[PDB]
Amino acid sequence: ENPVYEKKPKKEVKKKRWNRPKMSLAQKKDRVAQKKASFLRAQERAAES
RNA sequence: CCCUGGGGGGGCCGGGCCACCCCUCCCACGGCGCGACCGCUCUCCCAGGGGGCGGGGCGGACUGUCCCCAGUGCGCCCCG
């Protein structure tokens, strides 16, 4: 006698961020040289002193 | 009018113009400057080589055999 399935008013939010965005090309390119610089100080100063 | 019935020339009078020298419109095409709009972006620029569009925040998300202090994007607001 009642199959019609009314729906909730459902609005109730304006909230959005839960997972990371895809990091940019220049951000992952400068991460590489920030690793390359951090390896060479480990051999320059920490094998000489 | 000329030359010997005949021969050789000039014309007749009004109009405009592709146009002929001086003042005036519109289109097309080219060049040199100009204003404003839209689009792309960092050069002169700045702290010989060094760093760049810089400048701030509302800010946020990050990055690193760990200079934990330095470094990279993004959205907005506003100038170059």
Report the distance from CA of residue A33 to the C1' of nucleotide B3 in Å, as an integer. Answer: 117
Determine the length of chain A: 49
What token pair was written down for A40? 């060479």
Three-state SS string over A1-49 comes to CCCCCCCCCCCCCCCCCCCCCCCCHHHHHHHHHHHHHHHHHHHHCCCCC
Please tell me the experimental approach by which this structure was elucidated: cryo-EM
Nucleic strand B contacts from chain A, 1-49, CB < 7 Å:
17, 20-21, 23-24, 26-27, 30-31, 34-35, 37-39, 41-42, 46
